[PDB]
Structure formats: C-alpha cells, structure tokens
C-alpha cells in the first residue's frame, strides 16, 4: 500500500498542440501530478518517428534527475506525451507495479524498430511480446538516475537503441533488475496488437481491455503509424462518453460571445462546382443567416455556365445585404482546387477575418442558427453533421482503410441516427466547416493545400490537416440540415426542378406543394364543402402552377378537338376537348407519384373507411378560351372521383365561371389559384361547367381509380 | 419448458432423449413442445411411443405433426438450407416462444436433435446463475462449438484471439460474447425479455437472412447480452456437414460422437421406454480381424468391443501371452534369443518382457494367417480412438488399391512419423496413399499374404527387438546401418495412409496411461523393473511436433474427409 502521493509523472512536449491538451485532461481526471519538461524551447532533434531523432529528451531528463538523484521514497514515470491517454487510477497503477516487484519496467512491443541484428540476443518468452520499446517506463528514482547518468552523445542521435544496448547486457540487467511487461499488464501499445483491444463500457467511465491476456492496461500509447486509431479511441477513454452521462468535455470552453462589441468577423465562401438543384432557393436562404450583415463578407465562385442566370438575377440583393462581395466567373476556367486555394489565401493575408466558413452549394441548412453555434464551440476545425435523407450517407468517415479510402467503423451507424450526442473526433469532414483564423495564419502557412496532387481536393485537404497535428472535429448535437442528391440531373428542360420528385422529396414538397396543405390534412378547417359531397382543399402553390403552365405552353401542340381519337385505345371520345395528355410531356410518372403520395391520404381521411391506391389512366391539361371552344355539356365520368385544379387567377386573367351541379342546383363561382376540387363522378353528380367570356383559363383534371 | 425440434432424428433420438429424461428437476415443474415434420424416417413413430409412454409424469405435453409433405420443393436434398426452411424454422421457434409466454413459465430451454446433454445438472447450474440469455459450451471433435466471438459486417465468423483460451478451457466463468446458437436458455421473467423476437426481423435489419443472425440482432437491440460459460463438462454435439451429403452420413457422424463419449466416461445409456434398432454387424469385406488383448486387463477390452459393434464390426478375439510372467525355462524352449548388440534407442536398457509378449503374439498371428492362407487380415491393439467414417473410408481405399493392383504387403493405417522433414513420395494413381518411412507405434496395420510369407521367411527367432523397430528394417529405412547389416533381405514394400485413421487413446505422461509394456522387467534376471518414464518419456505426441512444413500436399484426397461450416 505505497502512498499515492509518491508518484510523479514526467512528460515532454515542446509546443502545446491539441494532443497535449487531451493527455493533460485525461491525466487530470484521476488527479495525477504532471510535471512537464522543455515547455517553450525548440525541438532540437529530428522527425518525430519517421526514421530517427529525439535523443534530446533523454538529455532533458538527465538534467532534471539531478534534483531527485538522492530520493528513495518516490516512484517516477516517464511517458511521451503527444499521443498518450491515461486509462486508469493511480492506486491501481502503484499496486500493479509493486506486485510486479521489479525496479524498472519497460513497455514491450512486437518489433525491433531501429535495428534488426540483435533480435536473437533478447531473452525468450513463450506468449507475450518479446522485444523492448523505450516509449515509457516506471521505476524508482535512484535506478533511473543510475540508468540515465551514462548518456554522452550528440543531441540528434537516436534514443531507443541506446536503451536497447544498455538493457541487452546480462550483468547490468541482473544488477539493476530491468524487466519487460511481456504480458502487457500496465503498458499497452497499439502497433501489432490492433486485433486484441475491446472497449469495456462502464457506468460512468470507459476502459480498454486486452482480450488475449485479459488485463486492463493503464497507458494506451498509440505509437508508430496508428495515430488514427488512437484518435478514434480519444472520444471515449476515460470520461469522454458514458452511457448515462451525455458527453464529457463537450459543453465547456464556450465563449458565450460576451463584450457587447459586434461578434467576430467571418469570411463566407459559397462554392457551386456542380449543376445543383434548387439553387435559387439556397441563394435566397443565404440572406437569412443570423449574423449582422455588416461583418460577413462573401465570395461566390461559380464554375458552370448553366447557373449563370440565377446568380445574375440574385446579385443585387446580395450586393446590398453584405458588407462586401466578390465573384469569379466560369470563363476563368479555374480548377476547383485553385478556387478553394484562392479563397483560403484571401483569408490568410487579411489580418482581420477571424474565421472562415466555407459552404458548398450542395448543402441545405435547415437550421438558421448554425453559424452562432459553430463559432461558439471554439475549436480549430469543426463541421456540422449534414445527413442525406433516410439513408446512411453523410459528410465524414468513421475510419481509413490502408488505401486512404472510406472504411466503415463500428459506431458510424450509431452516429448517423443521433443515438449519441457530442462533439466527436473524426479523420475527414467536408461540405461545411468553420476554420479558425490563427490556425490558418501560423499553423498551416503554405499555399497549395487543395491542389498539388492527382487526388481530389477534399481528400488532399483532409490529409494535409491530419499530417500537421490538428484534429478535425464534427458536432452533431442539434439538427443542422440535410444534403442534396445531385448524382443524376437532366438539365435539358425549361424548369428541370419539376422532375425532381424521386431524388429530393422533402425539398420538392417544401417548394412546390401549397404551404397550407399540412394544416388541411391534419383537419383544422380550411377544407370547404360548398355543396353536398364536394370538397375544396389546397394542393398546389403558385410556383408549381406557373412553371407547369409555362412548360405546357412551351410544348405548344394543343391537339384534340375531334370526336374521334388516336390517343385512346378505342379511338372514340365521348366528349372531345382541347387537351394535352401528360404522356406526351414525360410528366406522367411524376404526376402519378404526386397522386399516390399527396392526394391518397386526403381522401382516406375525408371519406372514412375507403382505401385507395391512386391508380390513374386519364390525366390532362385543358385550355378554355372564348374563341376556340366554350365549356362542356352535362355528362358523367368513368372514375370513382375526379380531381379538379385551377392553374391561374380568376378575374386577373379571365372572367368566367366554375362548375354547376345539376342535381343540387349548385354553382361554383370563383376558383382559387391553387386549390383542388373533389367529388364523386360516377353516378350521383350530373355536373356541367359554365363557359368563359374574357381571357383564358386552364384547369387540371385526373380520373383517379378507374 | 423444454422445447425440442426434431427432423431426421431417428438415428439419434434414443440417446438424446435418454439423457434428457434424467435432468435433475422435479418432473411436475416441466413441459414439452415436441414438434416435428418433413422427416423421411420413422421419427414420428418413436417420438409418439416415447411421449405417450411419458405423458403422465410431466406436467403438460404438446405436439404438432405435419408428416405431409415429405420434402421441400425448392431444395437440393436433406441437408440444403433453402430459404423456405429458414422461414419455417424461424416461424416455429417464434410460435414456441409465444406458447411459453401464455403458460406463465420461467425459462425456455431449447434443446435440438443431436445436442446430447450428458451432465444431469445442466438445468440447475444454468438456472442458479441469473443471466438473461445463457448457453453452455458443448464440446465437439474439432474446433466447432456453439458460440462465436465476433461478427464482422454482415454477421459472419471472425476469430478473435480470445477464442482458443476458452474452447480449450484455460479460463472459466461466464464471458460476454455476441453469439450463442443451438442449446441456450432464455429467461422469461425479467422485464427486458418482452422484446426478444424470432421471426419478424427488427425494422433496422440490414444483414443476410439466416436463422441465427436474426436473433443476435434482436438481442442486441433490446439490451440483453448473450453469455456462455464452461465451468465443467456439459455435453457433445456433432460438427455440421456440407450441404450435399446423405442421411447415412449424419447417422455415421452421430455414431462418431457417441463413440467419442466413451473415451473417458461410461457410455450414454439409451432411454428405457424406447428401444434401439439393433444393426447387423458386417465383416468389412475382409478375411479376418484380430485384436490383441490381455486377460488381466478387463476394462480396455469391453470398451473396444462396444466401439466395434458401434461401427457394426465383428471381431475374432485372440489372447496375448504374458511376457512378464514368463520365465527362462520356457523362454529358451522356443529358442528366443535377443538380437546381439541391441539396447534401448532412447534409454539404453537391453529389452523388456511386455515387448517380448507383444512380439510373440504378433508372431503367432502371422503364423496363423500363413497356415490358414488368408489373402488380407487386419490387426488392432488395446487402446484406440477411431476417426470419422473409419469403415467406409478404409473400404473405399482398399477397393481402389485392389482394383489397381500392386505389391502392397504391410499397408499402414496408424503410426508416428518421427522423420519430420520434406514430404514423402506419393504412389501414383492411388489416393490418400503415400510411401512408408521410419515410424514407431504399430497400432494398426493390414498384413497381407505375400508380406506375411516374406516376414516368416525372415526367421526372426534369433533376433528380438520391438516390432516398431523391427518393421522399418525389413523395408530398408532404418537409420542405423548395423541393424540392417545384421539382417539379410529387405523385400517388403510398406505403404501408409496420409489421413491417419487411428491415434493412441492416452499419450505419455497423461491421465489413464498404464503401459503394459515399457514398465516391466528385463528379458533376463528378475530384479530390474524399469519404472514408467515421466521425464524422458519422449513419446508425447507427433502432432504438435509435426506442425511445421511437413506439407504432403501433393496427395489426392477423397471426396469424403470434407465437412464443417462457419466455425473452422
């Protein structure tokens, strides 16, 4: 039962990057006592672990050990502190050390790293790891002073081989009792043992567990070329996410935007590198982000000529709204990498853009408060979590396969569906981020970050951020929006957005279907009954009607008018009208989908007990004009019920009348712009429409369920 | 609520039912759910006999027969998993679970056809442990068992290094794992156990459509974890076969498991209410079968016959002369003289008497087969463990050998390949057959007629050495050349089978090892009793010493000796 106060952890870390902060928090959670070394001076060694370097740390350690060179009651611990997270308690560590009994315990890994020749001169152990790795040791102060005093070399020469050569001596080993944690009872390495680690969750802390020997390590040390797996492990161990306690360090380090001074600046940058659907809506939405428009700059780089008219249309309002504007046309023939590079460079040189919030144009931001939250989270890089609709695609990757391409992780499905909440850590984000300014100034000072490689800009960007030692967060607390599917997009029409009911249903509904439709479906009024067993409810909106009628007119071939038919299988119309069947325009299947989804429920909630499939055969647009043909004679229809929709205003574009119902002596005076008419049309409604006098009127018809 | 599910169970229903009748549980607190269909054989008759014989002692029995039809439409055969079969199994188990929730019953223990629940205290030891889904770890003959240790992406086996230190019982106590199939034990009082569901897959299901990957998902979604623990020995089950075998194959496999029970326990008695359809032993297509045994040794022989009729093999028994008890007056009466300049190759001792008796017994066997003029005969010993499909494979191999025709004299079936090196030459056009080498342990070998005549032409009546050393000389493979020079002619052509078909039951320095030979007195005098060697036994096993680049992959292997599924 050695006293838990005689333990002194010594690390080494020149700068203060984010990994060091992670280690400091993890060690503080258990109340260790960390005393750092070399905080401020320059890294006088070499590459971190590429081939060689790092003999300088032993020199600092020797210089420090003169202070404790006499003490006998203290147990010292040395762990390299850039990629280590402490997974356990001090008392357990001391107990395991004492039970080991020895005086100096090293960490054992499965590879002889610097040199190969002395593989055989080590002892023989049947089961556990064999060789030595100088990444971290624990022992008495006196032995460590005796063991570090013998260092006299260049400040650049390698470190680990010196410890190896020293330990290899038999007499020295027996004199000072140097042992290896063959079975990984205290030190665990994540190189060559990446198939024996499982996360053992617990009530309010997490902990790893080496299955092959069933021990619970203390110092996970993700050495070598496995910093990605350690980054993944950094979300949980030791208090990051606990199955009852929400998150861990996930709500602190918040500025709360104080001072009263206008909030810090921004340099927005919208990129449109594809032909993307619903572009004008996104452009209009850009005018609503909750940030005073006297600070947010802008930069809108198009790259496709087809999108020129929309930006040309919407330019002046953006010019007025924001404190500055700049465009780049499609004629510069700029590669996407060059464009992103230019944006980043333009924020790097200005000493004022405190942030940089890029945003691709394939990202619909439902929430209007994203910028405030992202600025508030106060981290070096961060994204929102946009997810495709009803699927698993999203903008991040659980893990990297050895090919540096996507390889699924074990908690990606449990992140996409928001069963866990926090600010995670991830090895690739894209399509929205908030890069802090100083990180762009004095921690990534080169220019070519996106381009400079055959690889696509996104992967090269994320690699160039991973390599420098900067985490790529991803915050998925609230609902931040949804992506758009632009995989296939037929742009050879008048208004291509109409054919978009099979790929982006939700935005289609938000834009085309009338705004009051949900209220009428839920049943809080609006739905009218001017005459018995006829229904008058709102379906379509102004945009859809205008664009549909414009497309129909652009088609032109207003066939029909003959009592005999070529379009009908029988070839004999009971009552000809000047019409165009939807089968001609290609709008057949989309209209069938509209009937199947947005109309069926309305009838199944209005005529109780009826179940419909919304199968249709006849559906058309008819044009009424006082010149060519007047209204229709009384008749009946070969369907269970019919759908009647008006397509333009009454009085502003035509003076006429609606429909008249004979058996009730019922008149329909004024059709509204977007609503619809529902009535049985087989037996009990002998109906006939009044004619029109001035202007022109179009109506929609569909004979559902023949 | 013991809930069987039988199909083509006629070969094994007696033994499993007998071992399921004796579960130490007051039989007024139990039930049954036998529900069988789609069976070629007469499973219906035997099950009805048993259930009607026992419908009194239990609490409340059930039944659901569907004898018609007699096969699935879109199936290849009796062992193919067509999706209709998966659907039917899922629905039937779901109906069983639903029937065990309306009777207000704690626990539901899902035995299956072949899972021989040997230990009587299985139910008590699972019940007294208080976990929601626990499932004892049944042994087998190979790696196969009834718990995984990790599913990769779509629910297929991924071995995790914490498997072997469980299946070999190097750790104990219940271990959280993500898969248990066959024999488990649900609970039905705990609150969370109202969401387990067999058939209707959980709406978030993405993986394949098996019948044990639709359960693990359900138990993961409802926050109950499947345990497995192995504090003692529980049962046995046979390894699943490929999807293209016949019903006789399954019968043989379960016979093999029954045989495996006998190595260290009394046999698995059949029940008393139903009777076993005794089979007709056959003579293997041979001339003779022999078995050396000692009159004093009574335990070994009984097990050996039990094994022999278990594979419908008759036996012509012979008596082995006690070399230990014999004295010089009759030892020299036959001119028995030890070979000049012979010692123990490993210890240095000259000779022993148990080996003398074994040599005399083999000599008499050779003389008898020579006198009667048999074409081919089979020899055994008193400690065996028969491998899978022993009779059929030996029959097919010898049929091939005889049809081809060659100078086979001392074909081997079990030995120890001490000369661990690069592989041996394979005899052309013959499968599973390789040329001989230096090897001890003449446990089982088929002595031919011409080979017997040559060996008797040797006259080894002036030279006594152990037969495991005597045989390699006669076909010119002994390393020491002085022994070869002491002999004259080397006309024997020994062969051997590369899938070895007979292993020793007990190894050296192991339990149940009492060597009749080795530990005895020297051929002369009567006061040198060489004790059984513990340290320098040097005959541990040629299986962990052979795990090197021995290869022998150039051989042609049978369509049989291929089995197993996702597990190995």
């Amino acid at each position: 039962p050695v006293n838990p106060e005689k333990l002194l952890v010594i690390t080494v870390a020149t700068a203060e990057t984010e990994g060091y902060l992670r280690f400091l928090r993890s060690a503080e959670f258990f109340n260790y006592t960390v005393r750092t070394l070399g905080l401020g001076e320059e890294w006088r060694g070499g590459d971190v672990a590429r081939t060689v370097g790092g003999g300088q740390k032993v020199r600092w350690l020797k210089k420090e050990m003169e202070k404790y060179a006499d003490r006998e009651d203290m147990i010292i611990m040395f762990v390299d502190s850039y990629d280590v997270i402490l997974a356990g308690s001090p008392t357990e560590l001391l107990k395991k050390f004492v039970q080991s009994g020895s005086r100096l315990l090293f960490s054992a890994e499965s590879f002889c790293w610097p040199e190969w020749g002395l593989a055989e001169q080590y002892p023989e152990v049947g089961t556990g790891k064999r060789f030595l790795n100088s990444g971290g040791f624990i022992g008495f102060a006196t032995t460590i002073h005796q063991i570090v005093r013998q260092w006299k070399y260049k400040d650049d020469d390698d470190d680990q081989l010196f410890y190896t050569r020293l330990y290899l001596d038999p007499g020295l080993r027996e004199k000072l009792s140097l042992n290896l944690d063959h079975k990984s009872r205290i030190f665990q390495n994540l190189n060559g043992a990446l198939d024996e680690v499982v996360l053992k969750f617990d009530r309010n802390r997490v902990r790893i567990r080496n299955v092959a020997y069933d021990t619970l390590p203390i110092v996970v040390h993700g050495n070598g070329p496995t910093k990605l797996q350690l980054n993944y492990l950094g979300n949980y161990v030791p208090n990051g996410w606990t199955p009852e306690g929400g998150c861990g360090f996930c709500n602190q380090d918040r500025r709360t935007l104080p001072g009263g001074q206008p909030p810090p600046r921004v340099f927005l940058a919208v990129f449109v590198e594809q032909p993307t659907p619903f572009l004008p809506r996104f452009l209009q939405r850009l005018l609503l982000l909750d940030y005073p428009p006297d600070r947010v700059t802008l930069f809108l780089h198009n790259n496709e000529v087809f999108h020129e008219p929309h930006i040309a249309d919407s330019w002046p309002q953006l010019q007025d709204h924001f404190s500055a504007v700049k465009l780049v046309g499609p004629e510069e023939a700029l590669s996407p990498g060059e464009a992103r590079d230019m944006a980043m460079d333009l924020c790097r040189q200005d000493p004022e853009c405190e942030f940089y919030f890029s945003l691709d144009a394939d990202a619909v931001l439902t929430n209007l408060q994203t910028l405030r939250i992202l600025i508030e989270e106060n981290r070096k890089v961060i994204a929102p979590m946009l997810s495709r609709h009803g699927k698993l695609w999203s903008n991040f990757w659980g893990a990297l396969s050895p090919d540096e391409y996507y390889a699924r992780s074990e908690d990606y499905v449990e992140l996409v569906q928001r069963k866990r909440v926090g600010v995670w850590n991830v090895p690739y984000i894209s399509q929205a981020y908030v890069i802090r300014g100083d990180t762009l100034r004095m921690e990534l000072p080169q220019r070519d970050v996106f381009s400079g490689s055959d690889t696509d800009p996104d992967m090269a960007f994320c690699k160039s951020f991973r390599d420098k030692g900067i985490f790529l967060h991803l915050s998925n607390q609230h609902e931040f929006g949804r992506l758009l599917a632009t995989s296939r997009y037929d742009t050879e029409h008048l208004h291509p957005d109409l054919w978009q009911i099979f790929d982006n249903p939700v935005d289609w509904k938000e834009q085309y279907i009338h705004e009051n439709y949900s209220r009428a479906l839920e049943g809080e009024g609006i739905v009218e009954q001017p005459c018995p067993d006829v229904y008058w409810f709102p379906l379509l909106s102004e945009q859809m009607c205008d664009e549909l009628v414009a497309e129909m007119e652009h088609y032109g071939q207003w066939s029909g008018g003959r009592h005999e038919d070529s379009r009908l299988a029988g070839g004999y119309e009971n009552v000809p009208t000047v019409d165009i069947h939807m089968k001609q325009v290609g709008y057949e299947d989309q209209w069938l989908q509209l009937l199947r989804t947005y109309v069926g429920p309305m009838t199944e909630s209005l005529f109780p007990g009826y179940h419909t499939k919304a199968r249709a055969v006849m559906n058309f647009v008819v044009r009424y004009r006082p010149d060519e043909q007047p209204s229709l004679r009384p008749h009946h229809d070969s369907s269970t019920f019919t759908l009647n929709v008006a397509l333009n205003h009454k009085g502003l574009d035509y003076e006429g009348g609606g429909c008249r119902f004979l058996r009730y002596d019922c008149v329909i005076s004024s059709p509204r712009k977007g609503w619809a008419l529902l009535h049985p049309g087989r037996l009990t409604h002998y109906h006939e429409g009044l004619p029109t006098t001035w202007g022109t009127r179009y109506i929609m018809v569909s004979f559902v369920d023949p | 609520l013991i809930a069987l599910l039988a199909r083509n169970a006629a070969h094994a229903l007696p033994t499993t039912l007998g071992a399921l009748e004796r579960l130490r549980h007051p039989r007024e607190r139990t039930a049954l759910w036998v529900a069988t269909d789609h069976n070629m054989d007469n499973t219906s008759t035997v099950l009805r006999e048993w259930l009607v014989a026992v419908k009194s002692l239990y609490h409340s029995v059930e039944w659901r027969p569907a004898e018609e039809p007699r096969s699935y439409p879109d199936e290849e055969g009796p062992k193919h998993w067509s999706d209709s079969r998966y659907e039917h199994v899922m629905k039937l188990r779901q109906a069983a679970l639903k029937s065990a929730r309306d009777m207000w019953a704690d626990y539901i223990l899902f035995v299956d056809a072949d899972n021989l629940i040997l230990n009587p205290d299985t139910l008590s030891l699972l019940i007294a442990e208080n976990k929601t889904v626990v499932a004892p770890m049944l042994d087998s003959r190979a790696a196969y068992s009834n718990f995984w240790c990790g599913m990769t992406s779509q629910g297929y086996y991924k071995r995790t290094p914490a498997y072997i230190p469980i299946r070999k019982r190097d750790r104990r106590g219940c271990f959280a794992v993500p898969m248990v199939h066959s024999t488990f034990l649900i609970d039905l009082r705990k609150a969370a156990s109202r969401n387990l569901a067999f058939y209707p897959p959980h709406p978030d299901y993405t993986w394949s459509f098996d019948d044990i990957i639709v359960f693990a998902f359900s138990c993961k979604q409802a926050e109950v974890q499947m345990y497995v623990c192995n504090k003692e020995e529980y049962g046995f089950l046979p390894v699943p076969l490929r999807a293209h075998s016949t019903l006789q194959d399954e019968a043989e496999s379960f016979m093999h498991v029954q045989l495996e029970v006998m190595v260290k326990h009394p046999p698995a008695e059949p029940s008393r209410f139903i009777s076993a359809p005794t089979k007709t032993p056959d003579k293997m297509g041979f001339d003779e079968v022999f078995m050396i045994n000692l009159r004093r040794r009574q335990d070994r022989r009984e097990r050996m016959l039990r094994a022999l009729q278990a594979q419908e093999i008759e036996c012509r028994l012979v008596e082995a002369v006690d070399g230990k008890a014999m004295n010089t007056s009759q030892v020299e009466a036959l001119g028995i003289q030890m070979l000049p300049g012979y010692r123990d190759p490993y210890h240095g001792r000259p000779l022993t008497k148990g080996e003398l008796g074994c040599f005399l017994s083999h000599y008499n066997i050779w003389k008898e087969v020579v006198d009667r003029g048999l074409q081919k005969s089979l020899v055994f010993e008193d400690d065996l463990r028969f491998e899978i499909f022993f009779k059929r494979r030996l029959m097919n191999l010898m049929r091939d050998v005889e049809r081809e025709g060659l100078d086979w004299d001392l074909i081997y079936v079990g030995r120890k390949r001490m000369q661990v090196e690069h592989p041996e030459k394979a005899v052309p056009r013959v499968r599973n057959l390789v040329e001989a080498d230096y090897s001890y342990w003449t446990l089982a070998y088929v002595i031919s007629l011409q080979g017997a005549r040559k060996l008797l032409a040797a006259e080894p009546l002036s030279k006594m050495l152990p037969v495991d050393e005597f045989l390699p000389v006669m076909f010119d493979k002994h390393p020491v050349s002085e022994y070869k020079a002491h002999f004259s002619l080397r006309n024997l052509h020994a062969f051997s089978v590369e899938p070895l078909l007979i292993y020793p039951t007990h190894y050296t320095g192991d339990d149940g090892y009492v060597s009749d030979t080795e530990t005895s007195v020297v051929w002369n005098n009567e006061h040198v009793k060489t004790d059984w060697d513990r340290a320098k036994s040097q005959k541990m096993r040629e299986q962990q010493a052979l795990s090197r680049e021995a290869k022998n992959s150039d051989v042609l292997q049978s369509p049989l000796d291929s089995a197993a599924r996702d597990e190995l």
């Binding site: 990446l194 198939d195 680690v197 499982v198 996360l199 053992k200 969750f201 617990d202 009530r203 567990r209 797996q229 993944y232 492990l233 199955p243 893990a399 390889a407 699924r408 992780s409 074990e410 908690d411 | 207000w104 208080n130 976990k131 929601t132 990790g150 990769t152 992406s153 995790t160 959280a176 993500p178 009082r189 705990k190 609150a191 969370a192 156990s193 926050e223 109950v224 974890q225």
Partner: peptide
C-alpha cells in the same frame, strides 16, 4: 471494421408476481 464494443447492459427488474 475495428474496435468492437462490450456495451453496458444491466439486469432489468423482475416482473411482478401473477395473481
């Protein structure tokens, strides 16, 4: 496809006795 879990699942309370 790495780092499999050992999720924390406790023992749920017993259901109330029948009557």
């Amino acid at each position: 496809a790495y780092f499999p879990e050992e999720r924390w699942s406790p023992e749920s309370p017993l259901q109330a006795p029948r009557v």
